[PDB]
């Protein structure tokens, strides 16, 4: 018999993104080639099958630095990290291939699905 | 020119609640009288003006235990912690007064607003 506040989840995600932009309570650095990205482990886990597996591992859960596979493109990762914290995906002709490949590696099934759909249309 | 995934924020909150239920990456214990509640500091900050103030404080940001004011009712807190992680508020005749008082203390303005509306109707 609960009541529900429709905008609550969106408002929570908006505040988590504000914490990220101000580097507040970030507890991990994701290294992608020469580029570094600060984030919250819980948000990464909630969005990605790969980060979920990494941070539930009894040894990796305690690492402050995670290095991604050298094939991963820093721009594709940046677009996906922004999507994790906003629900908004900056999908463009020039980045769609790098975004899909990064989403497959990160195990973000809904992003992989829209990339496959957008590629099929063209 | 971004695209948006409508269910993303709700899915993120659902996964954060799953992490809470399994006690994964919880980094704080909230003590309310004899009762203890494990949670994620970032989620508490995203939902509450009080926790936002506490965990942005250069000294308190590093505490693993937070003790609430002894006037705070453990059941009212539990109902509000559940709302933070689900968007669902278990508001009942027998708990509305304790829920409103706890929401005022935690600075959760939308919960305070619906409690005032529900009290006014009766």
């Amino acid at each position: 018999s609960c009541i529900q506040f429709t905008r609550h989840a969106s408002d929570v995600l908006l505040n988590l993104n504000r914490l990220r932009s101000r580097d507040i309570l970030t507890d991990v650095v994701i290294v992608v080639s020469r580029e570094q990205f600060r984030a919250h482990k819980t948000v990464l886990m909630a969005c990605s099958g790969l980060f979920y597996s990494i941070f539930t591992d009894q040894l990796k859960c305690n690492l402050s630095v995670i290095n991604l596979d050298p094939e991963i493109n820093p721009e594709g990762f940046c677009i996906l990290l922004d999507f994790m914290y906003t629900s908004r995906l900056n999908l463009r002709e020039g980045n769609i291939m790098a975004v899909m490949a990064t989403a497959m590696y990160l195990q973000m099934e809904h992003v992989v699905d829209t990339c496959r759909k957008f590629i099929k249309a063209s | 020119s971004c695209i948006q995934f409508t269910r993303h924020a709700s899915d993120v909150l659902l996964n954060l609640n799953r992490l809470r239920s399994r006690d994964i990456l919880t980094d704080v214990v909230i003590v309310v009288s004899r009762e203890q509640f494990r949670a994620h500091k970032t989620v508490l900050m995203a939902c509450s003006g009080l926790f936002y103030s506490i965990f942005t404080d250069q000294l308190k940001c590093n505490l693993s235990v937070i003790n609430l004011d002894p006037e705070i009712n453990p059941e009212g807190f539990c109902i509000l912690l559940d709302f933070m992680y689900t968007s669902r508020l278990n508001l009942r005749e027998g708990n509305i007064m304790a829920v409103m008082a706890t929401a005022m203390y935690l600075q959760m303005e939308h919960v305070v607003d619906t409690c005032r509306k529900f009290i006014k109707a009766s």
Binding site: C2, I3, Q4, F5, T6 | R88, L89, T114
Partner: peptide
């Protein structure tokens, strides 16, 4: 607020 809604009835979910």
């Amino acid at each position: 607020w809604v009835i979910p």
